[model samples]
Target chain A: TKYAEGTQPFTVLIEGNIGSGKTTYLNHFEKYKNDICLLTEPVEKWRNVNGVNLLELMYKDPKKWAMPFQSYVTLTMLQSHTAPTNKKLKIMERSIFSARYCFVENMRRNGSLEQGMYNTLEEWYKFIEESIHVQADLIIYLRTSPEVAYERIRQRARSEESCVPLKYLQELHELHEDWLIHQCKVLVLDAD
Target chain B: TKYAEGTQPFTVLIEGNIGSGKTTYLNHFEKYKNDICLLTEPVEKWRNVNGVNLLELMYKDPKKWAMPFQSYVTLTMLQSHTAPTNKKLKIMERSIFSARYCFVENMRRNGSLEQGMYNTLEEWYKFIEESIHVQADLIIYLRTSPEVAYERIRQRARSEESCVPLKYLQELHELHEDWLIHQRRPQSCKVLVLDAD
Candidate 1:
């Protein structure tokens, strides 16, 4: 297994809207499992952090739980981003950039997270951007329309995402575009 | 130099209020510099973060700058805590515990940091506690009376400390006593108190 110059592998972040076939895309490369290190999103940890389902709480009452949910998500995503791997390539389902640009931005705009809470999270994000080394050699955006994403999410039938409306996916899609297409180095995949 | 079991040296946090002689205490161990790794408090880093004086801003306006100041302090202190060393002992001027128990707690009580901001910092602190490894084999508390500490501050005349009232030091002293002496929130590590007065 070849390593990058900084002891980090050639890192890639797989980003997309909810139910955009991210897991399936990761699974597609199963044949190259030996050479690639694949990391799924930490939905389980978000679902059960010390017997508390932060995801359910966030969806149910975002006004109260959005800050904590985003905080935990940033930490978990950071854990994945910085985790060491000996494989030639290290790929994760999502990255902290998406957590900040897409999810947190949506929450802030919708007023689910208050101004003070938003400022706190934003300051921490700036601190993280300065202090932490989050490697992203490439970002693979699984671009999917809101209708397609909503339908796929419905078909998947995850309990926490049960009430996820198409509007949410639409906002998320635009955010992904703004972050990946407009701002970052990204490769677009027609997942729809 | 000897090393600890897990490659972490026998860590010691020099806990105290301002003007408590923590740097002088650390300086006394200069003879054993080869065997010990000493980390001074990151006041310089706090004084200048990308040309912004976070410490000064925090003092001049607590409501607005406390969160960012404390946030940066936590990061720099964590860097020191997690920095690898081969020496047998790693003595740092101040640990994250003091930052939490003394400084943030004071701000929260004084209404300098609003409740929402306080909660945000608290949740991050909880997350950090669960995730990061802060090695603390022992703590050396340089106990000083608020009056003595204030007099020393006046003598030293640091620009930031110029406006730090004695009432603030009194609150900080009580908080330190609660955390270190009264054991209201004692750490698992052993505590050694010295009369710095």
Candidate 2:
């Protein structure tokens, strides 16, 4: 009884900047776990793949590992989207669209990924868009200022994220706005 | 002068089954090395990626490793195709097209690759075809029987290829025929079948 037949759940993608309290926001829905399939980000998979910390490697040398890291991230996110759920609601912490538009685009613009690498990743993204049925009923944008997000990240002290600057957060914020506001349907929630 | 200006080389792809004397044939052109950019298969890259023997792993557990191995193979082959050269004659040992038509197709048929995995690979292949310019002016098909290929493989004694069966070679030979002879998936270039047995 893991998946109900002929019933597609209402899916919601929880999107935000780094340290935008997505985890804390999803925690409040613990009481509704029976009705909701709350899927968090696959950070644990990125942290340790066959005993190799891909996130750490990417952070240490963005130019060398960024493309491969994002490729794996897209794969993991695809798995999350396609995962079967018996519940009426399927809520995911982050979506593949956000990863592509925000993070991968940032890497491409900043020269972390070469032109050929960027083009290949873009092709993969387009292929997935055309081929895979990634469902999205609603997107909840946790809007937070770059200053607040940076402060929260500093408080978090995650080793891989220690070097994340305020400027990066600012750029990510603009990208999120361009995507959720301009290109897609989203319900903005002020988390500042 | 590593690369000349605005002149596309006369590219040739050498296609064949395993142990079909492609190495020997390519070696014979060593005297013209200055005029020909001869690119052998990047098997060494497949053997070691960050100290992991991907080729060995793929051979040992194909169901798990075949798709990833072929993905990397395609990437490396793309690199070879796009590699800049000043030489007028550009000769290559194997090509991405052969890898797709022969090896990957064989894997898909024999259940070594799952259907979804196969679809993903096909998507990548189509994407490359549409987006990249992989040049091919001529194809040199090294024709050999499966029996002869199997015997030569055994004689070579490569440790990783030790488990390759005669049936695999037979299937590969048919796949090559379907690609090169019957024109199931035809190449745009001219093909010259050589009696390499």
Most DockQ-accurate candidate: 1
TM-score of 2: 0.57
Total clashing pairs for each candidate: 0, 0
In model 1, the clashing pairs are none
Over A5-24, each residue of candidate 1 has an lDDT whose tens digit, in order, gives 26577888999999898988
lDDT of each: 0.80, 0.80
True contacts kept of 2: 0.00
Residue A157 displacement in candidate 2 (angstroms): 32
The C-alpha local distance difference test score for the whole of candidate 2 amounts to 0.80
- Deviation in angstroms for B185 in model 1? 1.0
Write one digit per residue (lDDT tens) for candidate 2, span A1-192. Answer: 111223457889999999899999999988898888988999997787656677887899887567567777787787688777788889999999889999999988888876545655665676456545677889999999999989998888567987988888998999998888777468999997
User: Ten residues in a row with the worst lDDT in model 1 chain A?
Assistant: A1-10
